[PDB]
Design an enzyme around this catalytic site. Structure first.
Site, PDB file in Angstrom:
ATOM      1  CG  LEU A  19      -3.131  27.235  15.696  1.00  0.00           C
ATOM      2  CD1 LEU A  19      -2.774  27.175  17.221  1.00  0.00           C
ATOM      3  CD2 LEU A  19      -3.186  28.704  15.151  1.00  0.00           C
ATOM      4  N   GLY A  22      -0.007  17.669  10.877  1.00  0.00           N
ATOM      5  CA  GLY A  22       1.046  16.681  11.025  1.00  0.00           C
ATOM      6  C   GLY A  22       0.748  15.441  10.230  1.00  0.00           C
ATOM      7  CE  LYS A  42      -0.474  17.288  19.452  1.00  0.00           C
ATOM      8  NZ  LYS A  42       0.661  16.281  19.254  1.00  0.00           N
ATOM      9  CG  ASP A 129      10.833  14.235  22.512  1.00  0.00           C
ATOM     10  OD1 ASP A 129      11.825  13.821  21.844  1.00  0.00           O
ATOM     11  OD2 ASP A 129       9.878  14.882  22.004  1.00  0.00           O
TER      12      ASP A 129
END
Ligand SMILES: Cc1cc(Nc2nc(-c3ccccc3)nc3ccccc23)n[nH]1
Ligand SMILES: Cc1cc(Nc2nc(-c3ccccc3)nc3ccccc23)n[nH]1
EC number: 2.7.11.17
Lengths: 278, 277
Positions: A19, A22, A42, A129
């Protein structure tokens, strides 16, 4: 610090497409072989405690508006976060394509966020965040729920003071601000100038963009975008505000101006660039 | 080498009584809180290979072998979550039985053959099969049996490399004990015992083996064969008439077998672990 022996994650899940990718990690679509159910996984090389303590806390978080961490696997070389799959896209893309958009739609979104964040707070967790770019729709359905997946930083953090849960309530006020005009309340010339403006917490309801917006909405935001964390609304307080719990949220279409501002101000997406990859 | 984040094992299970204590570990009865299901949890401090061995065990799935359901780790302990079996020791059942035949012994050996044949297909040698680690699943009279120095095969003593054949020898030894209640090799001086085992010199002694079938003795002879290359596999043992046919006698032999069990297996390591400290 507790574990159990598992099998190879490749034996438990079928890894389908990547998907996004990083600086240090990658997210893959994964099918659980026993059930056919889909997850976003992840994958983090270990070569990149602290993260081990952090990720254990996420496992505890169960809320309808927060993307669930269903499991963490470990090999000698990697960590795997099995996350709940959401497929509704990014908040900003939805609003832009929406056709009709009002204060009630903004308030409906802020109400779900307040619920999620108030749950985190009761559980003893500060997000730190919170920002609209990491707000994703659960599904493509028009009526889908919203999911939590430098200009947004609270004044007391800039002022080198110890952060608290109030930090998140500030961020919810900044999100409410953006949802009703399509631009951020504080924007840089230098990061220097921006820092000094957040410290003073000096922002406007600017004309013409704010002219059609209710006093109620503006009052709501002033209680969250409050400089002094001790004066600022908690999530529980903000959820009782008439804009959220009452009927002061207007039903006028403000999509035209809000969409144009988003196009100008949020024209780059980190999701999109994780997808564009390597 | 693969692991998942888990919770405190004591948040998933209610630890009840200690079932037994060894030199290095403890087995405790534990109830899974979500289900009410009972397990036997072996708690092993890390302050005392085993990573690799434990992995294989978790893969072992057979109705006549005690299952390893899960393994938890804390910084200081490993916790092996095991299937609970509650029918007690084989030797105790036989002794209290009232009536006991070749058909009973053969039914017991058939199950063990099936369990060990599965281990062998999976690539696993047990290496320590013995009647003292055979337990009944439940207290029911027709309960299945479960796998949980004078029993070791000649080639092992001959300082030769072990193969799966080693377990088949052990099944012969178990079959022998089940039909008479005493071990096929015993001597006060183990210089002589070693030589008897190395040479596979044993009897069908009289009068204990008088009422046993030639079929039973033939089956044991094929398993208790000195040469591992001439010895029956489990697959072959399972097709023998005493197992698969009807040569197993229906004569009560409990009197002699129980007397011999009482003399020969008066001490239990499960009872010792229970007795504790
Ligand atoms: C945290 C998370 C992300 C997702 N879904 C997701 N996530 C991404 C994604 C895009 C870029 C970086 C990381 C993830 N892309 C997607 C495309 C189509 C459907 C779902 C999807 N589910 N959970
Ligand atoms: C490997 C295993 C052992 C058991 N059960 C068990 N195991 C023991 C036992 C006794 C001594 C040492 C270790 C275990 N004691 C028991 C008493 C009453 C019922 C069951 C029981 N279940 N699985």
């Amino acid at each position: 610090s507790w574990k159990k022996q598992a099998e190879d994650i490749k034996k438990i899940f079928e890894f389908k497409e990547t998907l996004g990718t990083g600086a240090f990690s990658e997210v893959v679509l994964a099918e659980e072989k026993a059930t056919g159910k889909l997850f976003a996984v992840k994958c983090i090389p270990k070569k990149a405690s602290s993260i081990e303590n952090e990720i254990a806390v996420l496992r505890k978080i169960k809320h309808e508006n927060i993307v669930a961490l269903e499991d963490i696997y470990e090999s000698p070389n990697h960590l795997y976060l099995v996350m709940q799959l959401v497929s509704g896209g990014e908040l900003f893309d939805r609003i832009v394509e929406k056709g009709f958009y009002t204060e009630k739609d903004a308030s409906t979104l802020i109400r779900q966020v307040l619920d999620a964040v108030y749950y985190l707070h009761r559980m003893g967790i500060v997000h730190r965040d919170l920002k609209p770019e990491n707000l994703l729709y659960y599904s493509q359905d028009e009526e889908s729920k919203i999911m939590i997946s430098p200009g947004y930083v609270a004044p007391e953090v800039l002022a080198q003071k110890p952060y608290s849960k109030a930090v998140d309530c500030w961020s919810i006020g900044v999100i409410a601000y953006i949802l009703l005009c399509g631009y951020p309340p504080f924007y840089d010339e230098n990061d220097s100038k921006l820092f000094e403006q957040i410290l003073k917490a000096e922002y406007e309801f600017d004309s013409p963009y704010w002219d059609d917006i209710s006093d109620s909405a503006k009052d709501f935001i002033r209680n969250l975008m409050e400089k002094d964390p001790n004066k600022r609304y908690t999530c529980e307080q903000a959820a009782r505000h008439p804009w959220i719990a009452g009927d002061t949220a207007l039903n006028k279409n403000i999509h035209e101006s809000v969409s144009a501002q988003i196009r100008k101000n949020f024209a780059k997406s980190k999701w999109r660039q994780a997808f564009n990859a390597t």
